[PDB]
A paper describes a structure:
Structural and functional analysis identified IPO as a member of the JRL family but with a different tetrameric association. The monomeric IPO from residues 1 to 154 shows a typical β-prism fold found in the JRL family, with 12 β-sheets (β3-β14) and 2 additional short, extended, N-terminal β-strands (β1-β2). Four IPO protomers form a compact tetrameric association by swapping their extended N termini from residues 1 to 10. Thus, the wound-inducible protein IPO from sweet potato has versatile carbohydrate binding properties and might play a role in plant defense.
IPO–Me-Gal belongs to an orthorhombic space group P212121. The Matthews coefficient and solvent content were 2.25 Å3/Da and 45.2%, respectively, for 4 molecules in an asymmetric unit. The 4 IPO–Me-Gal molecules shown in Figure 1D form the same tetrameric association as that of IPO–Me-Glc. In the structure IPO–Me-Gal, 10 hydrogen bonds are formed by the same residues Gly21, Tyr97, Gly141, Trp142, Tyr143, and Asp145 of IPO. The atom C7 of Me-Gal is shown in the Me…π interaction with Trp142 of IPO. However, Me-Gal and Me-Glc are epimers at the C4 position. The C4 atom of Me-Glc and Me-Gal could form one hydrogen bond with the amine group of Gly21 of IPO and one hydrogen bond with the β-carboxylic group of Asp145 of IPO. The KA values for Me-Gal and Me-Glc were 4.09×103 M−1 and 2.01×103 M−1, respectively.
Numbering used by the authors:
A (entry chain A), B (entry chain C), C (entry chain B), D (entry chain D): 1 to 154
Write the structure that this text describes.
Amino acid sequence: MALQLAAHSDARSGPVGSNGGQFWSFRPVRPLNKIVLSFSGSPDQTLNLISITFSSNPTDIITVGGVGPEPLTYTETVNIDGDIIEISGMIANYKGYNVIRSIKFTTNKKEYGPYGANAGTPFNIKIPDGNKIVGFFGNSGWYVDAIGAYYTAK
Amino acid sequence: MALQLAAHSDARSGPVGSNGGQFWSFRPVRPLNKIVLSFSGSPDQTLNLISITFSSNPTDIITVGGVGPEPLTYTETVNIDGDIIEISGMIANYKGYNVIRSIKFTTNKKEYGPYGANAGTPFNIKIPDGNKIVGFFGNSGWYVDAIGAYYTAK
Amino acid sequence: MALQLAAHSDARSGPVGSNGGQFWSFRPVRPLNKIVLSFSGSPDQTLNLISITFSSNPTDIITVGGVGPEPLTYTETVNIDGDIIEISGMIANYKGYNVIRSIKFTTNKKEYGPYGANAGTPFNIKIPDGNKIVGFFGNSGWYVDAIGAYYTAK
Amino acid sequence: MALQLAAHSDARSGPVGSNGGQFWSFRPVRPLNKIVLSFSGSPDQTLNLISITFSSNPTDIITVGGVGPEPLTYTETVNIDGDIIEISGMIANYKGYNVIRSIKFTTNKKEYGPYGANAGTPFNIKIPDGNKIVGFFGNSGWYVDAIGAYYTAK
Ligand SMILES: CO[C@H]1O[C@H](CO)[C@H](O)[C@H](O)[C@H]1O
Ligand SMILES: CO[C@H]1O[C@H](CO)[C@H](O)[C@H](O)[C@H]1O
Ligand SMILES: CO[C@H]1O[C@H](CO)[C@H](O)[C@H](O)[C@H]1O
Ligand SMILES: CO[C@H]1O[C@H](CO)[C@H](O)[C@H](O)[C@H]1O
């Protein structure tokens, strides 16, 4: 007595960047409210993006990249106001791997970034008008190798 | 030299049914305009769905199911008028496997079906208002084991 | 001129269950090592699965289901030993929705469950030999409507 | 009654390229064994990849790109022997869009190509050892904007 009412999966945009050790995915039920970027290096010189931590209130969270031995030295915290609708950045070599090196998040009312080392090959994830980004997925290893987003209407 | 503008993949609904021998996927760039359902048995008795052939003019086409030796004895040709917005049917046993046994296609203009043996466990692939089905995917072997749909805004 | 070295997304199994309010996805880069199932009702009587919390050390976590007004009364904490290789359970109606009602996790070393109300329509998420489940996805609302898994070799 | 034996969807690699008008997908149940690349331009000067026709000759076929007004002037027909294990090529601007401009296919038996214009930025779809490409997906419009592959073991 159980009708098979097909369950849905959100549209995807990307991934951009490069193949990495592990596929990762994080689409939480509630909106993303915070993104922490972790780096090695320093702002006065060059920041090396190593991992990204995505979270949604009150406790959903995931960290991708950062599984290597390099110690972190800096972090940038992005407090998301509203729905993300676009992301951009640069891809370039880091210790033998082409990785996400800088990232910028854009919502309906504000832009955050770009943060990191903004040099390299640009990437841009954009979605249809009237849609929102509701999660991210990609590949990662010691660093963040590729990134894509889940999106849906309204 | 070339912006990595993330490319999109349409949302999915399903699949419903059962795991089968091969995954299959068909999402043409022009509308799906014809579907041929091939069966063994008799329309005057019981029809057994063996394969489905989806096509989009001028020459896009795919057949899933039917790789077994059983001869086909009857076909139902469905000429699609309008956007497909819903699919439903029944899943039941056929020669050792739970398979898609009947299927009904609903568009914004007409309803087609159910075609086949309308007995078993019901399935229904429904999408949000304002969207349309633009492709199908599933699993198949000798028969049609599972089916799901790709959908996007109209 | 970063090479576009196509990045991979793991093979998927499912989902099973039914369409729900939101799509959710959680595939961490480290192994899933803990799953908390939250229920209303009681073990001595009938346990009603409401939400599931998946986590991977040290800090990855996600909770799906549980959005509604019903208070939680019991939880089953599963400490996963080994790679998850199979999941099974039952789907049945709960307050007007067909939902995941029980779930059993099988790793290469032990099995856990089934936990919940083991009655209704059985489901089984199986993968090819030599593979392991590395994440889960599905639909959820007030309850856990559908679930599927990400899997990969080894 | 029907046991919900979760059905599987093959792993994906990509897409590489750029977002385009429509998502397309083709994963036939029989091995892909024919690919036709259609161009405008001159084999001596520069070829402009307009569309690609993939087939599981002779039953399954799809053509992506080429829905615009530009006439084709030259085609490359590729008869694949064995399993495709890798593809690579260049991406570059064509009349306002960054599109797939050349492609080279590698099977366990031999190499095919490159076919197209050798200029732009490179892409490469590689898969795990012991796997094979069993389908393709991407974005397209007047041209082939993005491409990715479905792969599985064996
Ligand atoms: C140091 O190698 C590891 O990290 C890099 C960069 O992130 C890649 O992901 C690679 O596949 C993984 O094995
Ligand atoms: C006859 O077996 C074959 O066809 C059935 C039914 O379609 C399933 O797909 C199975 O996995 C496949 O090996
Ligand atoms: C009370 O409705 C909500 O919860 C149910 C059950 O979980 C479904 O998810 C539904 O789509 C969602 O809107
Ligand atoms: C001429 O525009 C059309 O073709 C280009 C190139 O293929 C892109 O697909 C674009 O989105 C589509 O509208």
